[PDB]
RNA sequence: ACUCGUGAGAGACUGCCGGGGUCAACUCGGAGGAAGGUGGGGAUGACGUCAAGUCAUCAUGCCCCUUAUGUCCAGGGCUUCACACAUGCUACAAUGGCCGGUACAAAGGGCUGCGAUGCCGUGAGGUGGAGCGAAUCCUUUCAAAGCCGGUCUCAGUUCGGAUCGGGGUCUGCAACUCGACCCCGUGAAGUCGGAGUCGCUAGUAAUCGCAGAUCAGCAACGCUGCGGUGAAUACGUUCCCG
């Protein structure tokens, strides 16, 4: 075990949490409902990339804000995915719910996002390099991307033996506080395993 | 009126100090019904002795945290402030001999992993 | 006759925003206030083993803490009192009013 | 020399071989042997060439001798066993025989990092 | 776990809220006083008569999500290697690393 | 032990099953599987067939048993030595 | 001491004596932590001492240090390959600590019923010339004299 | 003085020398000279016959030692061996009774280590 | 007003002085200061190694079972004991045992939980329920080692508590296998431990108590924390280890 989660190395400083709310007594089944609101929102969208879920509690009504690189996908026109979503949050018992859908700024320089789109990627058919290379050209030609560094390991290339390839472009200072790091890990479903893919992105610092 | 504080490892005293008599009245209490060890006394009255003011000076002394030790200790500190607040040109001779210095000697954190903060667990070879 | 006004949250700077724009509206309100006393913070504190199955000496310490302040008003008028229910406050820190 | 077999699984007559090869060495130790444990694994997955792997470790008089192999059966693991143990045992000796060639002794010859240094006079020799 | 003995918990609690609730407990009040006629009232042969699962002795909490049943966590209802990764994605809140 | 305000604990099958052996005053092999429960003194002739984990031993009640519980007299472990 | 020495504490003279070395002998005799257990033993042993002799303790202590103190010790030295007893000359701080461990371990297997009585004991023979550890120092002073040959390096 | 076929030792305090009874502990030493009147604080030589016989008296009056004490154990251990139970057998040979781990320890009931 | 609690800030930066220094890094000493030279302790673990550990937290490729290797239930087992190894606790006593009086902490926990006063038991404990979501009440007002007084007089003992007999309390549907605790009695080994070996550089080791998690109860002498009292020694890198 090398290096901790760099979202829980800087989480009282730069990070925030991605559940806002207070409990006493009702700490255990607000967790649970919170951990099934995101298993639940993890199956039901995959198409778009599903950058970060937030939940805020407040009495009987709930607020559920999902960042995505698509809000077109998630959305009914008529409101047909809308209603679907309403409707299963509401079989959540989570009693009132109302849902903010959002949209991302820039979806190359979202650590998550790249992730995803890497590993959908490997899965299919395309050689890891030519993966890595495309995605760490693209978010260095964001103009507020610093340093990014992607690493994937596993069975890489269908083959027998296990291994780990990381490129890094700039700087990625994972011991400095202050420096936000961008960190996402997803996996690939390949024919012959999983296939591990983590992002580390640098975007200056935070005073 | 003139009031300090002294801390010793957690030990929190609080001095009040007027001109009377040599008497010391610890939370109600005398020299001798408090602290009934000798060398505790003498780390008490040090300072007075080589600022040479005994016995010309009221003490009541709030007394809280700590054993006899740390609240000696903590005494000891605040009798020095108080002196050095009272007569100011005295305070080579307080701060060469080290009473206006506070201790930060506190309780190791004990750690993971081992009995104590340095203690570690026996490790066999063999 | 007083009210007491408890705040409880895990983030010290909402607490304070909270505690001070709570002191602005009783003063517009046209109130007497204390101010946001202090109390001790509350620490819960976990300890876990990193690795799934052995290697126990390895440990990782957590924390959860508790910032609470302390509300105090005094000529409690109604237009005070249906200001008190008409404020909006984050969803982290909670009021208890007693 | 009285040694402890653990192993695992199935290896039938992998213990009583064991503990007689290893017992054998017992002369070969030049010191004292405190204590003697053997433990014979099998690998599960059968594509490994070598599933059997045996390691010892001998507690000679306080120092740790440990050796480890792989083989295809009990048999030949605790003979290649023996042979590794054998080889650190001679590599342990440290009586005089083991360090007559070490000592540095040749006087004023082959310096050595414990070699006696030249003794100096304060004066320069001219 | 086994989904047989994360499910088997549930319907333990139901039974005991169906039967723990006032049921297995008023026969209890009942052997409390030494006044109260224990020896011919047979509460005893009666609270017997109950099934087991009406017992929370049998309840075993374990992770809300996982079905661990070692290193559970009151507070959050959770295992200690779930707790763990939850926490360094910042979603208990109120918690992080500790250093003093 | 158990407290003796609650009282000595016998289960309910093998309970109606003596007391219905004792009421014709005839005793035959009882097949039980409650080695928690007390010896009682309307025991005292029955002969019990007390669960081991394997088979059930039979259990010829005495006087002096009285107190203890069929499991004293199932022993569960065998060992004959090493 | 890899990379030089380490500082030296400097504990504070005794209160009701006004002498370093009595101070010294509280913390050699000090158990577990047990400050004031100790300096009723060595307040009580200096009292006999008194009340035996008839005249100031410490000056019968130094007396009996100075009988015990040592002057030549042994140590092993590793040159050229080759261990030897070789005699060395003790440094003042060493010879006192030694004098008072020695005093306080020959007081603790005395036979007078009493760590006050034993301690007593042990220090006024020391000072008349008969303790044990008078006899140690004289053990370690001919074992000095008998390895003299090896003085040389 | 030879008390209920005891002899006592030869200088003690009372309670502690009644101590030497076998059926006799601290606590019931105590008690019954509470209850017989002898001072406890007093040694073992300064008794008077009087004193002997209301200790003997007392003793033999709410009291069991000495040899029924014996007798009466060793009967109760035999008649807990000839019943068969559980404590029985563990009684027979010579293992702790009361659910003592004896994986390694239990040498008490075992007796001296024995080596094989 | 003084502590304290928790918000903001200042304060150590070789800043200054003197000397060594290539006038360079750096280094020695002094002053001022609460603190002097990364102040103390944490968190933080580079590329990799050891096919190290974990398909039993989880996920997962492939293979296998599928009237069973799936699943429900009672009982039993995981606690077996001629031994061997490892980590600990308690001791072998007078720097102590026992009895009476008496002084000083921190941290943490508590709602179907903490649970006080009182009363009843010798004691675990029983009845009862004040007040408390708690800087407020309860954990007693909080400790023990400590101090003072008496006693014990060097003994296998007033040391040591194992083992065992009997009698109880509580939790629990249920203490047989297989819980903890209380009372009476019983009173084993053990006289400071071979070869060899371990931890520790200062608020440290040694020693004393308190709390928490898991938890109906507990096998907790374990682990994670908190404070009380508080040493010795470092000449120096030849030898052992990395």
Redesign the interface.
């Known amino acids: 075990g090398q290096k901790i989660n760099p979202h829980g190395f800087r989480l009282g400083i730069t990070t925030e949490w991605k559940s806002r709310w207070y409990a006493d007594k009702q700490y255990k089944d607000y967790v649970k409902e919170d951990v099934a609101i995101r298993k639940l929102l993890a199956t039901g969208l995959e198409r778009a990339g599903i950058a970060d879920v937030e939940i805020e509690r407040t009495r009987d009504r709930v607020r559920v804000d999902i960042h995505t690189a698509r809000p077109g996908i998630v959305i009914g026109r008529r409101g047909t995915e809308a209603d679907r979503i309403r409707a299963d949050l509401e079989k959540l018992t989570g009693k009132q719910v109302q849902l903010n859908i959002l949209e991302v700024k820039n979806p190359e320089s979202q650590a998550q996002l790249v992730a995803q789109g890497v590993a959908e990627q490997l899965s299919n058919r395309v050689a890891f390099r030519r993966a890595m290379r495309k995605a760490i050209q693209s978010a260095m030609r964001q103009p507020n991307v610093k340093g990014i560094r992607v690493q994937c390991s596993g069975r890489l290339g269908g083959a027998e033996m296990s291994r780990s390839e990381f490129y890094r472009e700039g700087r990625v200072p994972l011991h400095t506080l202050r420096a936000d790091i961008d960190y996402g890990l997803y996996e690939a479903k390949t024919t012959f395993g999983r296939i591990g893919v983590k992002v580390w992105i640098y975007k200056g610092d935070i005073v | 009126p003139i009031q300090t504080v002294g801390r010793r490892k957690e030990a929190v005293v609080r001095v009040r100090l007027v001109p009377g008599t040599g008497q010391f009245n610890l939370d109600g209490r005398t020299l001798e019904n408090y602290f009934p060890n000798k060398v505790h006394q003498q780390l008490i009255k040090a300072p007075l002795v080589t600022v040479d003011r005994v016995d010309q000076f009221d003490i009541y002394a709030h007394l809280d945290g700590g054993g006899p030790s740390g609240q000696a200790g903590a005494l000891r500190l605040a009798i020095a402030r108080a002196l050095i607040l009272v007569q100011p040109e005295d305070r080579p001779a307080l701060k060469k001999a080290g009473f206006l210095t506070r201790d930060p000697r506190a309780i190791e954190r004990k750690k993971y992993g081992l009995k104590k903060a340095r203690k570690a667990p026996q490790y066999s070879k063999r | 006759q007083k009210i007491r006004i408890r705040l409880?949250?895990?983030?010290h700077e909402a607490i304070d925003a909270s505690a001070r724009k709570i002191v602005e509206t009783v003063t517009r309100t046209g109130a007497s206030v204390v101010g946001p006393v202090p109390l001790p913070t509350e620490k819960?504190?976990?300890?876990?083993?990193?690795?799934?199955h052995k290697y126990k000496?390895?440990?990782?310490?957590?924390?959860?803490?508790?910032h609470k302040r302390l509300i105090d008003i005094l000529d409690p008028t109604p237009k005070t009192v249906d200001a008190l229910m008409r404020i909006d406050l984050?969803?982290?820190?909670?009021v208890n009013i007693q | 020399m009285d040694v402890d077999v653990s192993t695992d699984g199935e290896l039938p007559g992998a213990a009583e071989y064991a503990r007689e090869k290893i017992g054998r060495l017992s002369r070969r130790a030049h010191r004292p042997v405190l204590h003697a444990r053997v433990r014979l694994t099998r690998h599960g997955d059968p594509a490994v060439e070598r599933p059997v792997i045996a390691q010892a470790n001998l507690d000679v008089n306080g120092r740790q001798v440990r050796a480890q192999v792989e083989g295809v059966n009990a048999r030949e693991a605790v003979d290649r066993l023996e042979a590794r143990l054998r080889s650190r045992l001679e590599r342990i000796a440290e009586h005089w025989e083991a360090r007559r060639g070490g000592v540095p002794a040749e006087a004023g010859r082959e310096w050595r990092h414990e070699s006696e240094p030249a003794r100096r006079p304060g004066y320069f020799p001219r | 776990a086994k989904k047989s003995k994360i499910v088997k918990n549930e319907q333990r609690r139901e039974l005991v809220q169906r039967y723990a609730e006032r049921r297995a407990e008023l026969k209890r009040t009942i052997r409390d006083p030494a006044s109260s006629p224990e020896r011919r009232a047979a509460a005893v042969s009666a609270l017997q008569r109950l099934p087991r699962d009406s017992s929370p002795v049998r309840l075993r909490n374990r992770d809300v999500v996982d079905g661990r049943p070692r290193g559970h966590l009151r507070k959050f209802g959770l295992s200690r290697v779930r707790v763990r990764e939850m926490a360094h994605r910042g979603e208990l809140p109120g918690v992080r690393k500790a250093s003093w | 032990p158990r407290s003796l305000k609650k009282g000595p604990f016998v289960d309910d099958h093998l309970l109606k099953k003596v007391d219905v052996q004792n009421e014709k005053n005839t005793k035959q092999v009882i097949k039980t599987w409650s080695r928690r429960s007390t010896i009682i003194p309307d025991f005292i002739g029955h002969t019990f067939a007390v669960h081991d984990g394997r088979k059930h031993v039979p259990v010829f009640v005495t006087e002096a048993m009285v107190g203890h519980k069929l499991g004293e007299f199932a022993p569960t472990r065998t060992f004959k030595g090493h | 001491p890899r990379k030089g020495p380490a500082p030296k504490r400097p504990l504070v003279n005794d209160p009701v004596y006004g002498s370093q070395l009595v101070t010294q002998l509280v913390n050699k005799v000090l158990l577990e932590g047990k400050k004031s257990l100790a300096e009723r033993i060595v307040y009580g042993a200096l009292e006999q001492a008194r009340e035996k002799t008839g005249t100031d303790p410490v000056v019968t202590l130094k007396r009996a240090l100075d009988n015990v103190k040592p002057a030549l010790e042994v140590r092993s030295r590793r040159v050229g390959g080759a261990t030897y007893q070789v005699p060395v000359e003790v440094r003042p701080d060493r010879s006192t600590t030694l004098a008072l461990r020695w005093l306080v371990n020959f007081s603790r297997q005395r036979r007078e019923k009493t760590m006050v009585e034993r301690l007593a004991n042990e220090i006024l023979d020391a000072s008349n010339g008969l303790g044990a550890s008078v006899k140690r120092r004289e053990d370690t002073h001919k074992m000095a004299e008998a390895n003299r040959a090896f003085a040389h390096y | 003085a030879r008390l209920v076929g005891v002899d006592l030792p030869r200088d003690k305090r009372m309670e502690i020398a009644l101590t030497y009874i076998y059926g006799i502990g601290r606590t019931r030493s105590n008690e019954i000279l509470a209850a017989t009147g002898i001072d406890k604080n007093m040694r073992t030589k300064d008794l008077t016959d009087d004193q002997v016989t209301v200790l003997r008296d007392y003793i033999e009056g709410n009291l069991k030692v000495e040899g029924d004490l014996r007798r009466e154990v060793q009967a109760d251990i035999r008649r807990k061996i000839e019943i068969g139970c559980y404590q029985g057998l563990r009684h027979r040979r010579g293992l702790p009774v009361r659910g003592q781990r004896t994986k390694t320890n239990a040498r008490t009931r075992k007796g001296p280590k024995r080596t094989i």
């Open positions: 409880k949250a895990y983030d819960n504190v976990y300890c876990v083993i990193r690795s799934p000496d390895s440990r990782e310490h957590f924390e959860m803490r508790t984050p969803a982290s820190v909670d």
